[PDB]
Amino acid sequence: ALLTFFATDARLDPAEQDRLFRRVMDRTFNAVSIDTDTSTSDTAVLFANGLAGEVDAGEFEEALHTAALALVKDIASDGEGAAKLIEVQVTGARDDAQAKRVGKTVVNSPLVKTAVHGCDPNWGRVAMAIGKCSDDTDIDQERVTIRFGEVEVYPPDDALRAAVAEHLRGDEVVIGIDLAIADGAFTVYGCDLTEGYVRLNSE
């Protein structure tokens, strides 16, 4: 499924370039799911010929990131037969690895995906999904907080209810999740589940 090729004329130290490339792929292309079906063919390449001279590596990783993250969002906005992007902002994990683990499970929950497709701020399903991380016993359902947009819906006026409904009617939906454990943070990307996805992949 996934093929992505980058090309630059900046001159970059081979070693430092390989690190900033992994670091960026980990926060970008390794942080997106449409249907969990990791493929037999995923490929991500960066070619850097020096026909533009030395460029500050720390500034190229920023640009490489902004660029990778731009394609990622395109991918997730164009998920097969999707209609809205989903972004799971996980914070307060014990560490980033965990925070990602939690985002993936949330963003791959068919019930979560369908709730979102239905414009439903179904935090109970977000909670359920969070719950599926059953080996993460420092996840305390009393310390977990869940939000749609900026608006926090868990733990549980009429204006904020309307704010959230408008947020879920849109095409890019943000699920915020704080675990209240440590400083672990990570954001993943995916989409709603629709009959179009089924119809295309069924046909």
């Binding site: 499924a1 996934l2 093929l3 992505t4 090729f5 980058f6 090309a7 630059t8 004329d9 900046a10 001159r11 081979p14 370039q17 490339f21 992994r22 792929m25 292309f29 390794n30 997106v32 799911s33 449409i34 249907d35 969990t36 079906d37 990791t38 493929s39 037999t40 063919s41 995923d42 490929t43 991500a44 390449v45 960066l46 070619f47 850097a48 010929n49 020096g50 026909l51 533009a52 001279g53 460029v55 500050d56 500034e59 190229f60 640009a63 490489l64 902004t66 660029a67 394609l71 990622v72 395109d74 991918i75 164009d78 998920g79 097969e80 999707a82 791959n108 996805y197 295309l200 992949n201």
Partner: protein, 173 residues
């Protein structure tokens, strides 16, 4: 927009629509390459070769066929993989281990090698540079839009294309 980056694209019939499904991107100049790939246990021949080719950190191009992943194609599929990678290499005059090969689409389906062999005979360095816009397009499978991003960094030009919106949750190394 990146200096010394050309883009070749052309119909080879990996699907009967006459659309561009065969692409090569190349630096007219030697280039440092970084790359990460699927780790599937059913990872096709193309992934294997790419891994090798990026070992030394040196590679200049990549040939990309769409509407056939050349996966679970057995030995015949491995040979077709080597053949097409080497062929593209010779045509543009480059070391084997500097040409990568990527392949997306149907699985368990052999290539159209009579038609791929024929197009291999006309493979030449393209005059003029650029053409990311039409590589973005020639790699698509189930995508509905082409995917292409452009960013300027300290005088250099970085440009990326991407494809894939199903069978999709990457985890590359």
């Amino acid at each position: 927009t990146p200096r010394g980056f050309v883009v070749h694209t052309a119909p080879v019939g990996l699907a009967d629509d006459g659309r561009d499904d065969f692409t090569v991107l190349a630096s007219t100049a030697p280039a440092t390459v970084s790359a990460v790939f699927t780790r599937s246990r059913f990872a096709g021949p193309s992934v294997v070769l790419c891994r090798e080719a990026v070992a030394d950190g040196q590679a200049r191009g990549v040939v990309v066929l769409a509407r056939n992943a050349n996966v679970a194609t057995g030995l015949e599929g491995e040979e077709n993989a080597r053949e097409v990678r080497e062929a593209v290499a010779r045509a543009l005059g480059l070391p084997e281990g500097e040409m990568l090969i990527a392949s997306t689409g149907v699985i368990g389906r052999q290539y159209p090698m009579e038609s791929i062999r024929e197009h291999l005979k006309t493979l030449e360095w393209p005059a003029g540079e650029g053409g990311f816009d039409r590589a973005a397009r020639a790699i698509m499978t189930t995508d509905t839009r082409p995917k292409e991003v452009r960013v300027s960094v300290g005088g250099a030009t970085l440009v990326g294309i991407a494809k894939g919106v199903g069978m999709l949750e990457p985890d590359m190394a």
